[PDB]
Design a protein around this ligand. Structure first.
Ligand SMILES: *[C@@H]1O[C@H](CO)[C@@H](O[C@@H]2O[C@H](CO)[C@@H](O)[C@H](O)[C@H]2NC(C)=O)[C@H](O)[C@H]1NC(C)=O
Lengths: 49, 48
């Protein structure tokens, strides 16, 4: 779909999930945007180290 | 809820008994299937 979905600077509207605690099951849909723990800390606010 | 398909089976009575649930065989017929796709972990029934 390059002919349609691309933009010269990049179509940065198209999003995917990069980090998760576990896999999701067959035909599951995870709607969430909570901050991911790669750090061990009980991580909270809009970031963490 | 099974691989994204919710399933329901159900039944209703002939019985006008004293109080507690009769031991007795009537099976639940299947009645509906819904492609709800969610994690149900918990639930709550609604009263009048
Ligand atoms: C549905 O949501 C529940 C509730 O968060 C998930 O169960 C939790 O899973 C994590 C990781 O195993 C545990 O730390 C919690 O203790 C679990 N809670 C319970 C009540 O067991 C569940 O995994 C989610 N379902 C799917 C398909 O991801």
């Amino acid at each position: 779909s390059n002919n349609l979905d691309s933009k010269v600077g990049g179509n940065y509207n198209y999003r995917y999930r990069l980090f998760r605690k576990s896999n999701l099951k067959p035909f599951e849909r995870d709607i969430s945007t909570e901050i991911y723990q790669a750090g061990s800390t009980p991580c909270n606010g809009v970031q963490g180290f | 809820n099974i691989d994204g398909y919710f399933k329901i089976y159900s039944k209703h009575t002939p019985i006008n008994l004293v109080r507690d649930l009769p031991h007795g065989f009537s099976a639940l017929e299947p009645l509906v299937d819904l492609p709800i796709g969610i994690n149900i972990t918990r639930f709550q029934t609604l009263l009048a």
